[PDB]
């Protein structure tokens, strides 16, 4: 079994570190049993996306195991929504950078 430490922000957000790509690029994510997709901000996020100014961004150009997909996605939670495109790569838990 693999333990993944989580941080707790105000008893509202529980999140841990993962890695995406070769070598791994580190991201913090909510391990969410209420949804089924994995997503992180892209280095290709639009300038209009203020959240991506202050969050870690995935750069496909730095990953040797990146596989282009490009299919559009749109995810709606209860809180709000987001969109982007699909990609394929190795996911590390914990980051292992």
């Amino acid at each position: 079994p693999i333990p993944e430490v989580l941080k707790n922000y105000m008893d509202a957000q529980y999140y841990g570190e993962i890695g995406i790509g070769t070598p791994p690029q580190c991201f913090t994510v909510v391990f969410d049993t209420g949804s089924s997709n994995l997503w992180v901000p892209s280095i290709h996020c639009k300038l209009l996306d203020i959240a991506c100014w202050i969050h870690h961004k995935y750069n496909s150009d730095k990953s040797s195991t990146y596989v282009k997909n490009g299919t559009s996605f749109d995810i709606h939670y209860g809180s709000g929504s987001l969109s982007g495109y699909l990609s394929q790569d190795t996911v590390s838990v914990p980051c292992q950078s």
Binding site: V5, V30, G34, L38, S42
Partner: protein
């Protein structure tokens, strides 16, 4: 650690609104069933299972309810961690394999009020901060505890009343899961003042998915949770 090969995931380019601006985290890693995956993408845990990266196809959460505590929580992939729970795990079967959905027998307020009187459907969601229930039933619950509407289905309770509030018990698999008022209230602080938020939010989940109650971080924090894909069941034990 684990390395999940050839995982399909989303590169987010647009995040409208303020939702994700203040959030401490970068993204979301969904752990529910493939049924609700957008674009029918094989989820991380499903890929992990197909690649046989763990011997047991289960994962477990410990969530701390004290924000000062180290660690803030722990996800165990491929097992459980007895250091974060007491006694034995009690299991319930998943009733629909999309969200981690289980049958909720009833919701009892110690002062007398009974909600979900004849049984209802509930999901176990680490990604929902609060307990969520139908608008009209949560309205009744909030009246019973003396809470007042804040905004968007949320309610506040005068902090001086918290110590005298009734416990709220959720009946799952014929057993009672009690939440004391300290368990179901959240102390919130802004501009050097403090307020007590009710841990129950009123929101109707529309069909075909709903109606559903949501057992969020408020519940998981009190009850260590095991998500079992091998037997399609959810396990609970009292958190350490």
């Amino acid at each position: 650690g684990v390395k999940v090969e050839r995982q399909v995931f989303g590169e987010a380019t647009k995040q409208p609104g303020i939702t994700f601006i203040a959030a401490k985290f970068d993204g979301i890693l969904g752990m529910a069933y493939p049924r609700i995956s957008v674009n029918n993408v094989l989820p991380v845990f499903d890929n992990l299972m197909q690649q046989k990266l763990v011997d047991q196809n289960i994962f477990s959460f410990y969530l701390s309810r004290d924000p000062d505590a180290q660690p803030g929580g722990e996800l165990m992939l491929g097992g459980t961690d007895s250091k974060y729970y007491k006694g034995s795990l009690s299991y319930l079967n998943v009733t629909r394999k999309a969200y981690w959905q289980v049958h909720l027998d009833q919701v009892e307020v110690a002062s007398g009020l009974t909600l979900c009187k004849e049984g209802c459907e509930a999901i176990v969601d680490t990604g929902t901060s609060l307990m969520v229930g139908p608008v009209d039933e949560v309205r009744e619950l909030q009246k019973a505890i003396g809470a007042v509407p804040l905004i968007q289905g949320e309610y506040m309770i005068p902090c001086e009343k918290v110590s005298t509030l009734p416990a709220i018990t959720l009946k799952l698999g014929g057993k009672g899961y009690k939440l004391s008022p300290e368990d179901y209230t959240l102390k919130v602080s802004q501009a050097g003042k403090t307020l007590c938020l009710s841990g129950f939010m009123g929101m109707d989940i529309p069909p075909p998915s709903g109606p559903l109650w949501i057992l969020g971080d408020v519940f998981i924090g009190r009850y260590y949770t095991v998500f079992d894909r091998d037997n399609n069941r959810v396990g609970f034990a009292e958190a350490a």
